[PDB]
Amino acid sequence: MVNAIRTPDQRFSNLDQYPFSPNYLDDLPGYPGLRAHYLDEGNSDAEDVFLCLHGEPTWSYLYRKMIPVFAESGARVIAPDFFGFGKSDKPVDEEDYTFEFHRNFLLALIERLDLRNITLVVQDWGGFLGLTLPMADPSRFKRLIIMNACLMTDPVTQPAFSAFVTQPADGFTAWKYDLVTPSDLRLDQFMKRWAPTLTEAEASAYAAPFPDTSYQAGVRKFPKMVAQRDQACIDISTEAISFWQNDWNGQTFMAIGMKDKLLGPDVMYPMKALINGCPEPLEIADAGHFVQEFGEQVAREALKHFAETE
């Protein structure tokens, strides 16, 4: 039962533009011996809470340009690091990382912190998992900010959410290749390739959580879960579609990183139609898969859109 390692704290000593204080949650229900890190910024007694979920192969550092904007508006911001990433503990075996392992962690976190009036902010795996959370406790969610993401349902139900896996060759195929094949995986080099506008310092922050390959089991497993979806993931993701289509009635805002070869327009437009009340997406021309790197714009416009619909 859950053999995991912890990244030395010194590895985070020289981060670029990450002045956010660490918060930890030990022994969450179903996760004994595991410490999870999360940021808790802005007014702790705020009525609105922005739950920012990251994806592969990043961490809360990805939301560093969005957190200040949300906090300045008077809202509380919660940005957790999934187990295997950021400052959270990292199981050594890939077999321990599953769809429900990460999903149940999010549910436990929300219950432990008793988060309400949540504006769900998602992208990539933050969305694959995040988008399935509201149907479990709908009264806790108020709004949604969705950036490049979708649902991991089966190919028949939604072909658009499976088609990108095989084409184009330089899309998810190259992405997965870059992550699961290198014996010595260098995340600073990976991120510089998939987010060409990052500075050397910023790319370095993405390598910070991983002193060596033994810390990368979660990183290697994520891409494999997009290609091989277990029955639980398919069932949960399918039920989630019905939620956004028939049950959801909250404020929504969508932003698409137009240069993303994985989850761009091909996926985002079909996603827009499935989310009841999702407005016309904000298309960010220069943004790639990691839309949050152009997040100040997304954050500001989302707040403006929300204010005009209360």
UniProtKB/Swiss-Prot annotation:
A molecular function GO annotation: epoxide hydrolase activity
pH profile of the protein: Optimum pH is 8.2.
Example of a GO biological process term: 1,2-dichloroethane catabolic process
Reaction equation(s) it catalyzes: 1-haloalkane + H2O = a halide anion + a primary alcohol + H(+); 1,2-dichloroethane + H2O = 2-chloroethanol + chloride + H(+)
Thermal characteristics: Optimum temperature is 37 degrees Celsius.
Pfam families: Abhydrolase_1 (PF00561)
Pathway terms, separated by semicolons: Xenobiotic degradation; 1,2-dichloroethane degradation; glycolate from 1,2-dichloroethane: step 1/4
Active-site residue numbers: D124, D260, H289
Residues annotated as domain AB hydrolase-1: 49-295
Entries under Gene3D superfamilies matching the protein: alpha/beta hydrolase
Residues binding chloride, per UniProt: W125, W175
Top-level taxon: Bacteria
Binding partners and assembly: Monomer.
UniProt-listed NCBIfam families: PRK00870.1 (NF002043)
HAMAP family for the chain: Haloalk_dehal_type1
Function: Catalyzes hydrolytic cleavage of carbon-halogen bonds in halogenated aliphatic compounds, leading to the formation of the corresponding primary alcohols, halide ions and protons. Has a broad substrate specificity, which includes terminally mono- and di- chlorinated and brominated alkanes (up to C4 only). The highest activity was found with 1,2-dichloroethane, 1,3-dichloropropane, and 1,2-dibromoethane.
Similarity comment: Belongs to the haloalkane dehalogenase family. Type 1 subfamily.
UniProt name for this protein: Haloalkane dehalogenase
Organism: Xanthobacter autotrophicus
The gene coding this protein: dhlA
